[PDB]
Amino acid sequence: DPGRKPLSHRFLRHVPVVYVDYPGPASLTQIYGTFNRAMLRLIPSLRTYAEPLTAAMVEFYTMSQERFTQDTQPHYIYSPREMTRWVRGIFEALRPLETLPVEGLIRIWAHEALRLFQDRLVEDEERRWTDENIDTVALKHFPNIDREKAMSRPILYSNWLSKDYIPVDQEELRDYVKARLKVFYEEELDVPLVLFNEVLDHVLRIDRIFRQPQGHLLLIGVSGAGKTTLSRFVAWMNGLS
Amino acid sequence: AATSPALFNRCVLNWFGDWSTEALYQVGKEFTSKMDLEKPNYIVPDYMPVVYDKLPQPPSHREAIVNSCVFVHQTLHQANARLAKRGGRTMAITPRHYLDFINHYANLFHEKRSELEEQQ
Amino acid sequence: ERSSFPRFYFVGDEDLLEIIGNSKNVAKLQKHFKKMFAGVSSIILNEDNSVVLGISSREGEEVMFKTPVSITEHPKINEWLTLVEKEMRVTLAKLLAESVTEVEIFGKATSIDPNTYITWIDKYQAQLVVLSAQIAWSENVETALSSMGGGGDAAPLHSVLSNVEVTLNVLADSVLMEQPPLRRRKLEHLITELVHQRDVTRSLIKSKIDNAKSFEWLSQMRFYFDPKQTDVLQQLSIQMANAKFNYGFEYLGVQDKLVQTPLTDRCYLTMTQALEARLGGSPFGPAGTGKTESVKALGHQLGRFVLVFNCDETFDFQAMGRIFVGLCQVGAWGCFDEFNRLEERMLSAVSQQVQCIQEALREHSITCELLNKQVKVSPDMAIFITMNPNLPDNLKKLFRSLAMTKPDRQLIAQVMLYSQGFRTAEVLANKIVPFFKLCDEQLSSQSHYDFGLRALKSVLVSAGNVKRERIQKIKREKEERGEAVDEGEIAENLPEQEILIQSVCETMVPKLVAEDIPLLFSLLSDVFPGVQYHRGEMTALREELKKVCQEMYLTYGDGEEVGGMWVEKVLQLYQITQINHGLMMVGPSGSGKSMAWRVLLKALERLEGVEGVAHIIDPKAISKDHLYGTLDPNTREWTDGLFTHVLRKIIDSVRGELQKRQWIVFDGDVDPEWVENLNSVLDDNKLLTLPNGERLSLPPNVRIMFEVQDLKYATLATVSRCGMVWFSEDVLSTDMIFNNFLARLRSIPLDESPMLQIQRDAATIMQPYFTSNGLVTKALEHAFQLEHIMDLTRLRCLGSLFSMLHQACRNVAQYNA
Amino acid sequence: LFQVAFNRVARGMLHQDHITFAMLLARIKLKGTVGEPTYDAEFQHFLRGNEIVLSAGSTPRIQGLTVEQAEAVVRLSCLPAFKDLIAKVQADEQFGIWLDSSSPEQTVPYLWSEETPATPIGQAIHRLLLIQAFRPDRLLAMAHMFVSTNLGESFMSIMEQPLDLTHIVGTEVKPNTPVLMCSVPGYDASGHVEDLAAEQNTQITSIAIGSAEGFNQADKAINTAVKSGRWVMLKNVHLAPGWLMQLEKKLHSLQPHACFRLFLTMEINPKVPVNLLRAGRIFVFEPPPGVKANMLRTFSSIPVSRICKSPNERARLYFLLAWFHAIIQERLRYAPLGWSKKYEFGESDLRSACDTVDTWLDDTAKGRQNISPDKIPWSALKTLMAQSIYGGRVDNEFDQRLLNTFLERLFTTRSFDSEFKLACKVDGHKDIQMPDGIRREEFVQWVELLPDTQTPSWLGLPNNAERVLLTTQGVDMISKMLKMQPAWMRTLHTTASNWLHLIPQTLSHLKRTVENIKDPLFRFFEREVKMGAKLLQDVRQDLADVVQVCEGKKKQTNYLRTLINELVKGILPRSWSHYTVPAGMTVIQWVSDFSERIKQLQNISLAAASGGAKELKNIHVCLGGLFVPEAYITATRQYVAQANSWSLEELCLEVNVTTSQGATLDACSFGVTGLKLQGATCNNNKLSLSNAISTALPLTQLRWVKQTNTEKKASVVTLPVYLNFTRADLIFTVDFEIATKEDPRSFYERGVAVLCT
Numbered sequence A: 001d002p003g004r005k006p007l008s009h010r011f012l013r014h015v016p017v018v019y020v021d022y023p024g025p026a027s028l029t030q031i032y033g034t035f036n037r038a039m040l041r042l043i044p045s046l047r048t049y050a051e052p053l054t055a056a057m058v059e060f061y062t063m064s065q066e067r068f069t070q071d072t073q074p075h076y077i078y079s080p081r082e083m084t085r086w087v088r089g090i091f092e093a094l095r096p097l098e099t100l101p102v103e104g105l106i107r108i109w110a111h112e113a114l115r116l117f118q119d120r121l122v123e124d125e126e127r128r129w130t131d132e133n134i135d136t137v138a139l140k141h142f143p144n145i146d147r148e149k150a151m152s153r154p155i156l157y158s159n160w161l162s163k164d165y166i167p168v169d170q171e172e173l174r175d176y177v178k179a180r181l182k183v184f185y186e187e188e189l190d191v192p193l194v195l196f197n198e199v200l201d202h203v204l205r206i207d208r209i210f211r212q213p214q215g216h217l218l219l220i221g222v223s224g225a226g227k228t229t230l231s232r233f234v235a236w237m238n239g240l241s
Numbered sequence B: 001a002a003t004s005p006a007l008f009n010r011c012v013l014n015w016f017g018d019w020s021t022e023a024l025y026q027v028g029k030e031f032t033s034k035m036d037l038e039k040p041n042y043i044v045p046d047y048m049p050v051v052y053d054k055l056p057q058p059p060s061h062r063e064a065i066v067n068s069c070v071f072v073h074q075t076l077h078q079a080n081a082r083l084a085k086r087g088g089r090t091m092a093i094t095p096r097h098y099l100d101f102i103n104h105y106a107n108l109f110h111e112k113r114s115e116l117e118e119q120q
Numbered sequence C: 001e002r003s004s005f006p007r008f009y010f011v012g013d014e015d016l017l018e019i020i021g022n023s024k025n026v027a028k029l030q031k032h033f034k035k036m037f038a039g040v041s042s043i044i045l046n047e048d049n050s051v052v053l054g055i056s057s058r059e060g061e062e063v064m065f066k067t068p069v070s071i072t073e074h075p076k077i078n079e080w081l082t083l084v085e086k087e088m089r090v091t092l093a094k095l096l097a098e099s100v101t102e103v104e105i106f107g108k109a110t111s112i113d114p115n116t117y118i119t120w121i122d123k124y125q126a127q128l129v130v131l132s133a134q135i136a137w138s139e140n141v142e143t144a145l146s147s148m149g150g151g152g153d154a155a156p157l158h159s160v161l162s163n164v165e166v167t168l169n170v171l172a173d174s175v176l177m178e179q180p181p182l183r184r185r186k187l188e189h190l191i192t193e194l195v196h197q198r199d200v201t202r203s204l205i206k207s208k209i210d211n212a213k214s215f216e217w218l219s220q221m222r223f224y225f226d227p228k229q230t231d232v233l234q235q236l237s238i239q240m241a242n243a244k245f246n247y248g249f250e251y252l253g254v255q256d257k258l259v260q261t262p263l264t265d266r267c268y269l270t271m272t273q274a275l276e277a278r279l280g281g282s283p284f285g286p287a288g289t290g291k292t293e294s295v296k297a298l299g300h301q302l303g304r305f306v307l308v309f310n311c312d313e314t315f316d317f318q319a320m321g322r323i324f325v326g327l328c329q330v331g332a333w334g335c336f337d338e339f340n341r342l343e344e345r346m347l348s349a350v351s352q353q354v355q356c357i358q359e360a361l362r363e364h365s366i367t368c369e370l371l372n373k374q375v376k377v378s379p380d381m382a383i384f385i386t387m388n389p390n391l392p393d394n395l396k397k398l399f400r401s402l403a404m405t406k407p408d409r410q411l412i413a414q415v416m417l418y419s420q421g422f423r424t425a426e427v428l429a430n431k432i433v434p435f436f437k438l439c440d441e442q443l444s445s446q447s448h449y450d451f452g453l454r455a456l457k458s459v460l461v462s463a464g465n466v467k468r469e470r471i472q473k474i475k476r477e478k479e480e481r482g483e484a485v486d487e488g489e490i491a492e493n494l495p496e497q498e499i500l501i502q503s504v505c506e507t508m509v510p511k512l513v514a515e516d517i518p519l520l521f522s523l524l525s526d527v528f529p530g531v532q533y534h535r536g537e538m539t540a541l542r543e544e545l546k547k548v549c550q551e552m553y554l555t556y557g558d559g560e561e562v563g564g565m566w567v568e569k570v571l572q573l574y575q576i577t578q579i580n581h582g583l584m585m586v587g588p589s590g591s592g593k594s595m596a597w598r599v600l601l602k603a604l605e606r607l608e609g610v611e612g613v614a615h616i617i618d619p620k621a622i623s624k625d626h627l628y629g630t631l632d633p634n635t636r637e638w639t640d641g642l643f644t645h646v647l648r649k650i651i652d653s654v655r656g657e658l659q660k661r662q663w664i665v666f667d668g669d670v671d672p673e674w675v676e677n678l679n680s681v682l683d684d685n686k687l688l689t690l691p692n693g694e695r696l697s698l699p700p701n702v703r704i705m706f707e708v709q710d711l712k713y714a715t716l717a718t719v720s721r722c723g724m725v726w727f728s729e730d731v732l733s734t735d736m737i738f739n740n741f742l743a744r745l746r747s748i749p750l751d752e753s754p755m756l757q758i759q760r761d762a763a764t765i766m767q768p769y770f771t772s773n774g775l776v777t778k779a780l781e782h783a784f785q786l787e788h789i790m791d792l793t794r795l796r797c798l799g800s801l802f803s804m805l806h807q808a809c810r811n812v813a814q815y816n817a
Numbered sequence D: 001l002f003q004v005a006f007n008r009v010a011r012g013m014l015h016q017d018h019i020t021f022a023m024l025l026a027r028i029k030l031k032g033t034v035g036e037p038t039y040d041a042e043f044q045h046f047l048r049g050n051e052i053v054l055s056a057g058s059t060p061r062i063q064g065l066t067v068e069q070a071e072a073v074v075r076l077s078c079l080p081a082f083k084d085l086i087a088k089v090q091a092d093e094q095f096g097i098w099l100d101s102s103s104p105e106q107t108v109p110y111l112w113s114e115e116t117p118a119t120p121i122g123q124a125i126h127r128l129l130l131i132q133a134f135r136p137d138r139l140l141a142m143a144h145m146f147v148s149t150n151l152g153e154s155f156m157s158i159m160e161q162p163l164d165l166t167h168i169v170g171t172e173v174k175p176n177t178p179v180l181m182c183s184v185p186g187y188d189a190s191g192h193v194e195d196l197a198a199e200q201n202t203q204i205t206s207i208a209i210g211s212a213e214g215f216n217q218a219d220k221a222i223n224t225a226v227k228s229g230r231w232v233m234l235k236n237v238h239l240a241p242g243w244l245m246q247l248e249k250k251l252h253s254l255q256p257h258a259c260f261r262l263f264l265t266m267e268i269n270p271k272v273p274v275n276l277l278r279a280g281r282i283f284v285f286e287p288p289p290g291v292k293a294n295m296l297r298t299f300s301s302i303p304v305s306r307i308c309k310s311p312n313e314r315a316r317l318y319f320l321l322a323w324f325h326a327i328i329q330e331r332l333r334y335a336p337l338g339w340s341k342k343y344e345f346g347e348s349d350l351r352s353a354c355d356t357v358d359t360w361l362d363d364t365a366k367g368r369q370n371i372s373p374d375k376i377p378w379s380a381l382k383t384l385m386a387q388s389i390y391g392g393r394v395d396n397e398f399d400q401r402l403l404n405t406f407l408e409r410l411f412t413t414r415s416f417d418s419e420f421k422l423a424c425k426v427d428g429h430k431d432i433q434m435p436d437g438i439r440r441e442e443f444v445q446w447v448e449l450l451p452d453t454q455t456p457s458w459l460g461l462p463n464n465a466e467r468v469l470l471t472t473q474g475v476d477m478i479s480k481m482l483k484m485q486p487a488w489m490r491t492l493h494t495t496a497s498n499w500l501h502l503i504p505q506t507l508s509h510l511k512r513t514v515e516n517i518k519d520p521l522f523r524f525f526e527r528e529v530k531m532g533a534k535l536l537q538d539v540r541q542d543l544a545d546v547v548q549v550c551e552g553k554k555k556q557t558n559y560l561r562t563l564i565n566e567l568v569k570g571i572l573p574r575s576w577s578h579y580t581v582p583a584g585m586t587v588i589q590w591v592s593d594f595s596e597r598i599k600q601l602q603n604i605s606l607a608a609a610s611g612g613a614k615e616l617k618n619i620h621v622c623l624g625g626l627f628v629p630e631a632y633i634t635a636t637r638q639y640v641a642q643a644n645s646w647s648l649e650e651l652c653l654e655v656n657v658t659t660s661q662g663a664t665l666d667a668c669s670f671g672v673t674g675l676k677l678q679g680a681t682c683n684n685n686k687l688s689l690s691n692a693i694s695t696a697l698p699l700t701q702l703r704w705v706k707q708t709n710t711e712k713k714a715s716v717v718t719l720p721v722y723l724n725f726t727r728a729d730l731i732f733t734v735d736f737e738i739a740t741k742e743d744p745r746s747f748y749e750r751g752v753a754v755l756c757t
């Protein structure tokens, strides 16, 4: 791996080395089925979906890691850490939801998959591939569900309007962030910003990571696209100096 | 990645990339709103050079000019890519360039109107 | 202060401060003398430490002053230092006069008595006796040419050549028997000079020169001593060609004499001509051709001390500036080594300063601006610049050039063989030099291979030593059966090619890989046909090795038997320990070097009765400042480094460690950063030089070794200056590893006995699997064919396997419990 | 525009590059002309003729033409206008007198056949191609005529006249712009500008640049002169590049007086910053060629008082010294032949030699008005000028032997006779006669009286050496014009594919065996095949990766990137070159040499496989193809020593040159092919001086015999064996017997040597 230097043979002589490779698909299924069974106890009426849900997450993760190899991009690394983050985020989303149908679970699962395995992509074709394949996996493992509500294209999740982190429509979110941006203009630096849906997605992701403790970002994009502007906006809105 | 592992170990990364055609179209409409390019003499061409995905089926004059602006930005990107392919030296074309293009359009239109419409 | 008597202006502001604040305690001023004097490492005083009785060299030769200098009468540091220097010069002049008179008595004689000759050699210094011989020969040749000035007359120069021949014969007789090392060095230098004089006299005889003013005689370095001259400095004037140099009479000390090959003669002529035209000379050429030491020997021969700088990538200004302007004030020569290696800005600065000083020197043909100071430049200045290929553009018109393309290695070997006392030296030289050419070219290229001229010199010195040892052995044998002892008879009936071959194999075979040994044997057969050798295998040491291996559970083998290669490697390590003080145990990790020296130490302890303890020092893990010693920038306090601390402990003889054998092994990687300080110890001088100036003499029983796995990145100087043994991986086959594992399991208990019986039973059960070509060996051979996330090393797998079998034995123990 | 551009720009060029710029100007004007054809194919061939690959059977071996002439004819015959060249050469009879004519370019016959009459420029270019193909030595003179046909006869006529400082400084130069007077080492241009200032009654300040105080005087002088208007001079400013950069930025922001003139005399070295060269006018000064010119310069440099001293023979000694220095310095231009490398025989060594002469003359003759010529310390001067002066820079043994030959021929008591021949057979029977005068004035009159027809035979070299220099300069001009004029990846793919087709596929290692191991020849050859196979595999893999990148299927890594850069620029990759190669060799020539070497190694491998060590001994091998030839000589010595049970050092090498068919393969004889002997011809193992450039040895037999311990005869000469024509590698030394009436000193002077290739 880049940045890693081969070790001295004199040192390796005294030190045995064991290769702790990525856990196998069966191991991942077992571990995250245990986690999901512990996950879904909060909603008893939804407990029965843990086994297919874990299988779906494992299946999508396997094909994501076979597709976006490290060769294509230096940051195209997939690990069980990503799916553990998936589990933690899903649990954080289901915590406030005392009641929820399977459609909401599918929506949150798709949202977290998009926020984990779809942001690191660079090419629009890769993102479209990810969306098509998440659709296929969701339909494969949850056939008795409606596509329009469970997998509505504007997957926008925010805790800004509602008290909880429940899904939010793009238009109401746009209006709220427009009011907040007017307050930003009147208080902070006055630079006109237009609100296209990409801004909405980016600001939601940035606020999500800032809310999480030890929230650390690596903003990558052409200069002037608004990385610093959006970062300052989110920091001001969340009270961070 | 090689020099610093922490940037890719636990820090999450978000690919802003560049503004899409939709974003550029929205910027063009929002920024070029004060200027009045409402031309009733406009006629819809049989062939319309669409570059914005959600362009309304009847192109208005303002829609046409914003679409042309997005097309100009796309052609700058394409020319930059072509020079990169040919091996010549290249300079990145940022969305800040698009903002400056819109501002210069506003300035030129405002001054030329302020003089020759006074003469009107 | 420093303007008056600029001889101490060599030393820095630090040493100046110490010599100022500590002027009274003269016992602490030896460091400044060691810095500034050539060979004088100490100054001899009485018990009261108030009168300067004499001077002493680093080897031990001492010169007593005719009129001692009293420090009490001259409390000022500079005044009594000047008196000491002047007294040293005048006393050396008096000694030279006495010695030249004595050798003139020895001269013009049909035969000479060895006893009186050895007495004369012991009375004076090596430098003094060499100079006395040179003036004696020069005066004899001048007298013969003056007689020959008539033309067409009978030549007494034949008688001079015959006198040189007979004294050369008595020298060749005097070196076969054992002599003290200092007298041995004196004899070697004197034989070198007499060989050169005989060769040049033969050339003069062949040329039929009949005029003292003929250039064929003027081109040789002639020596003119004037006893009538009132100034002792001007008494000896050195003349060659049209140039003149007054002999400086500085005590250069007993140094390594440099033989004057025709290349060296050309260098002498070129540098002398350049100095007469009042500009320095540049002996450019490839490295290892004697560019620097030609300058050094020219300086030594003129009674001048030369400062040889190291123009490395990491080079200093202030120390260089002060030492170089100190040369400017003193008048001593200064030599630059690998002048091209300097960085471009470094190059420009040094070029500008040397250009200014050179143009000042030509103006003298007087002070110059140096470090914002006026520096009195003595006429006796020479500045010589060796390069490896050009001179900077500002210096091309200021310096003469000279090409050191190739030394005459044949004459080098011949003269050194004849110095060691070898008969038929010409045949041995004409065989050895092409032999090393073949070794350099035909043998497979290796980073650790070094087959240069220094290798020739070391090999020939070792050959002389082993020939003398064989002479002593035959003498002891002759005294134990019979009584008729005659050294000449032993020398005559002793062959000589076999001894040279044995020395070559002793010094080089340990450094060859397994493949190159038959190649070396073929080269020996090609150069030395029909003559062979048998190594004197140390049978008693072999028994000690088998016992130590039995008690340390290691195997023991002989010849082609299992373990034979390792035993032979241990024997070669013992031999190189015998014939060297600096060792280089090189080989891939896992070759067994650690016990390759541990078992040897234990065997020597149990055989010779000399108990041994090793200090295993890691250089890379520790900081170099803490490794060698730290000197505070402000408080100037010196704290001994680890290596310095152990050397001080070993020298102190607190618990009788001088009688004890001790091995300081430097296990770990080596890089040319710390070992550069060690470049003062691996040389025959054998002393460690610290930044504070204090040097510690290397005790004879101390052997320093560096268990380094590879030598890709070490400098060639360190490689050439220490003996080196190669430990290929094939030395240790897996069978020895298995046997050691089984013995370790069987005898020692695992916890620190029932579980000992458990271990014995388990080892007995898995004995069939651990045999040669067993299941484990085949699994390893197949496993090596596979790929692994890390580099695959045999001992890694073997250690993991042994640890896991130990865990199995522990599981058995817990189940039984 | 054309004339002024050439006149101004060429003022800042070396003389060897004026013709290149003139040719570029001619091409530009030819393109400008509308009625004249582009001649694109003609110029394309004229620049890239050597790149065409031929075959042994492609040369029909026309009588009266050399082999190189044969390939030159056949390669240029590819042009449609020159398709009928072979038949016209065969039929023509005047071709013989034209080929060896002194100036063939003046009367080039009409060979090329065309349907319509050619334009004068077309005739000129056709004759230029003809000259390049037939007599490449006359390429420079024909290029001059071609440019004269294009740009007028007197286009270069300005260059021959001495440069007029008055007009170029009075006008057409800005006071801000500094005058850069760049001279090659050994020449100072201060005199010209000082005479300019003196004639133009201008007070000029001259300050040398040697130290910081020099910087101070320079700054004060320029600060005074910017406002006062006087001229200011800085000397040897190449010593301080950073300070020169600071001076340039100082001059950038400065408006001086109209009469301000800043002159920068400097040595031509790359350390000079580019900005000053771009911001200042550059003038190039070179020492005029000719022994006469060098002698005049040397005599002018030495003060008149020093030469005329109490001994009247001192003038004679000084004249001999000046002539010797002129001879050595002029042999430098003929670097491959006159010497082994471009030594720095500057002015300083001449000054040191004069000092030595003065000292030894004063010592020998202590204030005596006259001295006998035999009493002169000739041996002293000879040895000092062989070892100390003129020899310190001499590294090669044979160069030092040559210097000894010159000193013995010149510095002798016999020189002081009126019949002394300062040189021999310079042009037929005529030889240089040394002056009979005893004072400096007669010698000055004699040197000013030289016919100025300084042929290379004046230096002792063969008269064909100047033709070799002209051919080398012609090839140099061809290369420079070629350098003067994405598709690059496509052409790189094309050339990589062709080279992969040309280079052999693999090399087979030798089979190890114990009796073969004992044999030394087998060991040397197995090392050679191992090295060759490893390097061939490396090159083939690199070419495969290059091709793989060319389709785009592979990404250009750093190693691949630098290799591609080297290939595009035409410079040899450092990884490919593991054996010693001539410095000036291009990539294509290296590929051809590598292919031939691999062919030879395949032959030796199959020969060893068919038989064994015994057959391996009896093989005829070209030493040039072998990577390490001296290893081969050493291996033969080892083989004979082992066979005859003799020691290695007691063996000496003997050479028997014979035809391949008429040769005997003795037990101690080894066949050697490919050796070419330059400067002489050997028949029946006897050397004879000849004017031929190189005579190919049919077959060289290396016989090792026991040391006879007998002195070599006076007719025995030692000839160096260089690996290539660069003469940078000394493989070994052969001994030959010269014919009667031949002088071994003449052999030494003419640079006769044996070349592996």
Ligand SMILES: Nc1ncnc2c1ncn2[C@@H]1O[C@H](COP(=O)(O)OP(=O)(O)OP(=O)(O)O)[C@@H](O)[C@H]1O
Binding pocket: A010, A013, C553, C554, C555, C556, C563, C566, C588, C589, C590, C591, C592, C593, C594, C595, C596, C707, C708, C709, C732, C736, C737, C739, C740, C795
């Ligand atoms: N004669 C022997 N009999 C049995 N085992 C042996 C013998 N010699 C060496 N070994 C074994 O081989 C190994 C040598 O270890 P050692 O530390 O000396 O290796 P090394 O070559 O010096 O490597 P490094 O560079 O890592 O220090 C040990 O496992 C030791 O038990």
Ligand SMILES: Nc1ncnc2c1ncn2[C@@H]1O[C@H](COP(=O)(O)OP(=O)(O)O)[C@@H](O)[C@H]1O
Binding pocket: A191, A192, A193, A194, A195, A196, A199, A222, A223, A224, A225, A226, A227, A228, A229, A230, B027, B099
């Ligand atoms: N959504 C947006 N609409 C309009 N302009 C924007 C938007 N985001 C950023 N900008 C413009 O980007 C500029 C700031 O760029 P900045 O964020 O500093 O670049 P970077 O993202 O490289 O840090 C502002 O002047 C602003 O006008």
Ligand SMILES: Nc1ncnc2c1ncn2[C@@H]1O[C@H](COP(=O)(O)OP(=O)(O)O)[C@@H](O)[C@H]1O
Binding pocket: C258, C259, C260, C261, C264, C285, C286, C287, C288, C289, C290, C291, C292, C293, C294, C386, C404, C407, C412, C453, C454, C457
């Ligand atoms: N003329 C000579 N006589 C004896 N030994 C020599 C001679 N020339 C060189 N040597 C040996 O060869 C080595 C030369 O080292 P050095 O002088 O540093 O080479 P260089 O000056 O070319 O760098 C030394 O070890 C020295 O003992």
